[PDB]
Structure 1
Amino acid sequence: RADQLADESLESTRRMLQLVEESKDAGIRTLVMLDEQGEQLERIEEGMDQINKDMKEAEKNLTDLGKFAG
């Protein structure tokens, strides 16, 4: 029965090696990828808060100016 033992062992080792390495490299590429989205989100957050401040101050000063005119 050692023939089936050897055949199944060879099949098992090959499949485990290939699947393990593939899953490894896969997750690896995801790891490398995530940081780009992280920094993009940081930059957009900076930009949006800048927009908010600028527009708020502009409108409040403009309401003040309109009140002064009237």
Structure 2
Amino acid sequence: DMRNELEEMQRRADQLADESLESTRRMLQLVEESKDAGIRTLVMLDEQGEQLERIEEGMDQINKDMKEAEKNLTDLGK
């Protein structure tokens, strides 16, 4: 009558982490810095676009003025 039976106990392997808290924090800090740099680039790019738009009008005005002056001088000369 040496017929034995058993029961079982369970253990849980550690969840997936303990490497997600050293590279993670550095990743977040770098992401924040990149976000700030992107915001600054946004602002600078908008300012540059405004300045180019401003330049356009003066360019067109000088072109028109020179063309009209040349035509007038030619007309009077002949």
Alignment of 1:11-50 (within 5 A): 11-50=22-61
Larger gyration radius, structure 1 or structure 2:
2
Go from structure 1 to structure 2 and tell me whether the alpha carbon gap of 1:44 and 1:2 turns closer, same or farther (over 3 Å shift). farther
- In structure 2, the gaps of 5 or more residues are 1-11
Deviations 1:7-38 (A, max 9, x none): 52221221111111011111111111111111
Question: Scaled by the length of structure 1, what TM-score is found?
Answer: 0.80
Relative to structure 1, is the Cα distance of residues 36 and 2 closer, same or farther in structure 2, using a 3 angstrom cutoff?
farther
Write the distance in 2 (CA, Å) between the matches of 1:4 and 1:15.
21
SS at match of 2:51: helix
Structure with higher helix content: 1
- 1:65 is displaced (CA, Å) by 0.4
Unaligned runs of 5+ in 1: none
Percent identity for Structure 1 against Structure 2: 100
CA-CA distance at 1:43 after TM superposition: 1.1
Query: Are the structure 2 counterparts of residues 46 and 2 from structure 1 closer, same or farther at C-alpha, using a change threshold of 3 Å?
Result: farther
Change (3 A) 1:14 1:3: farther
Matched positions, count: 67
